[PDB]
Amino acid sequence: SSRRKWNKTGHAVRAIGRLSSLENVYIKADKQKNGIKANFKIRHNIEDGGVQLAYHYQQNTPIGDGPVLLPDNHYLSVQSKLSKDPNEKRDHMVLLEFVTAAGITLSKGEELFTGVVPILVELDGDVNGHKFSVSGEGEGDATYGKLTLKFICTTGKLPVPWPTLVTTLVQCFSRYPDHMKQHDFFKSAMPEGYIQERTIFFKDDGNYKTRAEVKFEGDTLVNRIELKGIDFKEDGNILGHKLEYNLPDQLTEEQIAEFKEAFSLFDKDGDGTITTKELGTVMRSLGQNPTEAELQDMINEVDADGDGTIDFPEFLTMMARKGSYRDTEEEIREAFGVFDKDGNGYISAAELRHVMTNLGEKLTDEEVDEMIREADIDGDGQVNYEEFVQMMT
Ligand SMILES: [Ca+2]
Ligand SMILES: [Ca+2]
Ligand SMILES: [Ca+2]
Ligand SMILES: [Ca+2]
């Protein structure tokens, strides 16, 4: 009962947190090279709690002379599942991906991706002097933005965690909606292909420099990559293999139920969609003052159909992703600061009362005190950072 209030409010706060962040693959045109630039952020869960961030900068240039499509600013959204082959002795990765383009509200090479295309991947790498090779094969179905691939480390033991290689290991398989067909540089550069260059900064650790050639060889789409890693800590999350491999399908029906409870705090008229006005209302009642522009930006970050609203499914998707990948300490501390309005490091009854009252949740002072009780571990009559965290898991 009180836990439900903590989780509902918590989920609402973390939802605004997510809508404030930039979690997609952001693509912009680069006229100087008739290609595109991209930038994005990857969250890698750390085995025993915590998250390792990987910041990506990306550049793509066509290989051929033929005309290509230069996109308006937009993004790709990616869902990955990593798994193992039960009958594989070798160090390997089974990878399933769904990639979809969005971010804009409501070519010849494209023809090559109408059906299922075979894929081959070859990677030679060197990180802090630890050399390795990866070879992968599978297929892509751009109609659904689907990729399915199996990768083998052909030199024995992979000296870095599989998850860190994923973004390096064919964005031409992304699904562009009809109203965005003209923004698909990747397919447009086919069959001759493109060079794709990245630098990937692992926070508080080393970096990768990758150069890859993505093109058709016969009927097969082939990605050939070289990767150099430097400045890695030998006992860090990467070289020390401290990153989790997979996340669960989870979503205990109770979790979805909680997501829905959070959703209905935003959807105050119960039409199954959240507007800029609704998102705004909640944000203000939490003590923020975003402008209409910002509201539109936040919605566009998750607005799959481009209708300018967050509908219930889009919200569920957003929350499922937010539940998969852990938040940084700073993010949790900001969430905390939403309650800890004086910044003293402690959530007092008066503060929790201010929040719940402004939120519209009408309860008695005794109910507030009960919430504090449910949260209070050490018994000081307040909620501190650590208690907050242990509450929001
Ligand atoms: Ca609504
Ligand atoms: Ca929508
Ligand atoms: Ca306080
Ligand atoms: Ca306490």
Swiss-Prot record:
What's the reported outcome of changing Q171L? In RSGFP4; increases fluorescence and shifts the major exitation peak to 489-490 nm
Variant or mutagenesis effect after changing Q182R: In Azurite; shifts the excitation and emission spectra to shorter wavelengths and increases quantum yields compared to BFP
Changing I42T: reported impact? Answer: In P11; increases fluorescence at 475 nm excitation and at warmer temperatures such as 37 degrees Celsius. In Esmerald; leads to brighter fluorescence. In VisGreen; leads to brighter fluorescence
What effect on the protein does mutating V99R have, as reported in its record? In Azurite; shifts the excitation and emission spectra to shorter wavelengths and increases quantum yields compared to BFP
Which tissue types show expression of this protein? Photocytes.
What does the UniProt record tell us about how this protein is modified after translation? Answer: Contains a chromophore consisting of modified amino acid residues. Maturation of the chromophore requires nothing other than molecular oxygen.
Recorded hits in InterPro entries, A to Z, give:
GFP, GFP-related, Green_fluorescent_prot
> What UniProt keywords are attached to this protein's entry?
Chromophore, Luminescence, Photoprotein
Please tell me, according to the UniProt entry, what happens when changing S135R. In mut1.28; shifts fluorescence lifetime from 3.03 to 2.76 ns. In mut2.2; shifts fluorescence lifetime from 3.03 to 1.94 ns. In mut3.3; shifts fluorescence lifetime from 3.03 to 1.88 ns
Q: What is the effect of changing N207T?
A: In EBFP1.2; shifts the excitation and emission spectra to shorter wavelengths and increases quantum yields compared to BFP
- Disulphide linkage map: none
Q: Per the UniProt entry, what are the Gene Ontology biological process annotations, in alphabetical order? A: bioluminescence; generation of precursor metabolites and energy
Query: What is the protein name for this chain?
Result: Green fluorescent protein
